[PDB]
Amino acid sequence: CDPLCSSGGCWGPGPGQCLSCRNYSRGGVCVTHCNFLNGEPREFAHEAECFSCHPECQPMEGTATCNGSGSDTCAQCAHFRDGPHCVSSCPHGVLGAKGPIYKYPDVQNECRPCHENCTQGCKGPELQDCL
Amino acid sequence: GSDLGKKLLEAARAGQDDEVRILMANGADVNAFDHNGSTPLHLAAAIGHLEIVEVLLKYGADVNAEDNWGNTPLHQAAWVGHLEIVEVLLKNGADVNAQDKFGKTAFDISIDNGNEDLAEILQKLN
């Protein structure tokens, strides 16, 4: 049996062949720990299982990169942030509840609304900022 | 393919054509969706990236997928005036008479926005 299997026992000598893990498991394979502080992809744990952080979470050094799988549970957004979600880009007319949503990124890479009358996007909040 | 589906949604969103091609070659879920129900095809249709639209369609994207509001990618393409994307979606089986939450088709949307070319294309193609 692999040393990462619990006191219970195993069905084969491999890490992915234990009946239960001593510490953590990544896709049914026993591991010493998840990619909490180092490694790729960065991970969080739930019930002793390792799950990947959303790819838009900025990988943090010496601290957790996320506490869940959603783009809203990152410690920091790698690129831009739209409301609670880490996104690779601000909306470019993607449909929302009342039609197309256009936003621009601010100095802090936060997505802010375009002016009501912008049809091709914007680079700021004013009407003269349309396009 | 689930981790790659999340990466696929972001690459399609940012119009990263090469990234999408690499992600599809690695088997990313082409019908994955974000918190708005938007699939990679909805996102590609909004930013106007015709080659991303064609790559996703080649890899089996559902041309009639709906977001949280009942919108198909044809609705998204018509709303922002992407005529060539409307033409490619129609060629790959898009339902021309799919209705949104207000009972409107791509044609009604084009008429409501005064896009005469889009309305004409929709009439001639179907």
Author numbering:
A (entry chain B): 481 to 611
B (entry chain A): 11 to 136
The article reads:
HER3 (ErbB3), which had long been neglected, has emerged as a key oncogene, regulating the activity of other receptors and being involved in progression and tumor escape in multiple types of cancer. Designed ankyrin-repeat proteins (DARPins) constitute a class of artificial repeat proteins that were developed as alternatives to antibodies. Here, the selection of DARPins targeting extracellular domain 4 of HER3 (HER3d4) is described. The DARPin D5 epitope comprises HER3d4 residues 568–577.
One of the selected DARPins, D5, in complex with HER3d4 crystallized in two closely related crystal forms that diffracted to 2.3 and 2.0 Å resolution, respectively. The data processing suggested two different indexing solutions: either space group P21, with unit-cell parmeters a = 64.87, b = 62.25, c = 74.54 Å, β = 102.41°, or space group P212121, with unit-cell parmeters a = 62.26, b = 64.95, c = 144.90 Å. In the monoclinic setting the structure comprises two complexes that are related by a twofold noncrystallographic symmetry (NCS) axis running almost parallel to the crystallographic c axis (0.13° tilt between the NCS and unit-cell axes). A comparison of the lattices revealed that the packings are almost identical. The only obvious difference is a small shift between the ab planes relative to each other of less than 1 Å. Indeed, superposition of NCS-related chains within each of the crystal forms P21 and P212121 revealed root-mean-square deviations (r.m.s.d.s) for all atoms of 0.164 Å (1554 atoms) and 0.304 Å (1657 atoms), respectively. The L86Q framework mutation positions the hydrophilic Gln86 side chain between the Val574 and Leu575 side chains, where it forms hydrogen bonds to the HER3d4 main-chain atoms Gly573 O and Leu575 N, thus explaining its selection.
